[PDB]
Amino acid sequence: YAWNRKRISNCVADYSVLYNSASFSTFKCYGVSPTKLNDLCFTNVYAD
């Protein structure tokens, strides 16, 4: 209910490591394929 928000910016992102982790039971992306994610660049990424 309290959900925390963190702001992430000004860097380069390696998402593939996140994808290539056996550790996540569900990894569903609406809009990006988990792969090819490395190709995108964004103004602000928010993590909840």
Binding site: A22, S25, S33, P34
Partner: protein, 48 residues
């Protein structure tokens, strides 16, 4: 025919992506067929 895991069964289908779906076996988008799955714990699950 396969040895795939239970949670995995979802992956043997057209559009899906995942561990088996990418590297192990890939059904085509156009796939015309059936996917029959039944857990055979008895046949191959030994202690250890």
């Amino acid at each position: 025919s396969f040895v795939i895991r239970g949670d995995e069964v979802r992956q043997i289908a057209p559009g899906q992506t995942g561990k088996i779906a990418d590297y192990n076996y890939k059904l085509p988008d156009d796939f015309t067929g059936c996917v029959i799955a039944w857990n055979s714990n008895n046949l191959d699950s030994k202690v250890g």
